[PDB]
Design a protein around this ligand. Sequence first.
Ligand SMILES: Cn1nc(O)c2c1CN(C(=O)c1cc(O)cc(=O)o1)CC2
Length: 167
Amino acid sequence: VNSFSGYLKLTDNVYIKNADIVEEAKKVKPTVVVNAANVYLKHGGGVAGALNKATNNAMQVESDDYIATNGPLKVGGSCVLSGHNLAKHCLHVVGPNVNKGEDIQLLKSAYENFNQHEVLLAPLLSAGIFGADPIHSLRVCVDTVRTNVYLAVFDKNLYDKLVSSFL
Ligand SMILES: Cn1nc(O)c2c1CN(C(=O)c1cc(O)cc(=O)o1)CC2
């Protein structure tokens, strides 16, 4: 039993809710919140911008030190950093950004990072400002992630479309 509430169950291991991931993280304090990161960990907008703002820019400060030491992530890759006031840990995962021309096949590699964590609160990778089709992202999630994932979808209209079209 865990503290996630109000989710619709899609599969054995994938759950979904119309929710603001920032507000959900603040309330649950999950072990892992996933950020929709880019390779530079520049958290300017979308989910990343919102998570970073909720940490009062502490996420960005930590991320800048990470990049200065380690260099950029790979598209499809990830790193574990602090969750600050939102979670124990933040798993920064880089899905492909279609608006930069990155290969959508890398979306599966991105979701594979979730399998290193037993339970996660996450957004749909490559959705929103990353330009991918969220219906496709949900399909890849369900077909790739084997650990327990709680998906937060900010837009109510999109949430309803994702549920109604789910096979
Ligand atoms: C600035 N702020 N603070 C918050 O709690 C939120 C925001 C803004 N926001 C996003 O930028 C966003 C975009 C998106 O595609 C998915 C998502 O989960 O969040 C949603 C929730």
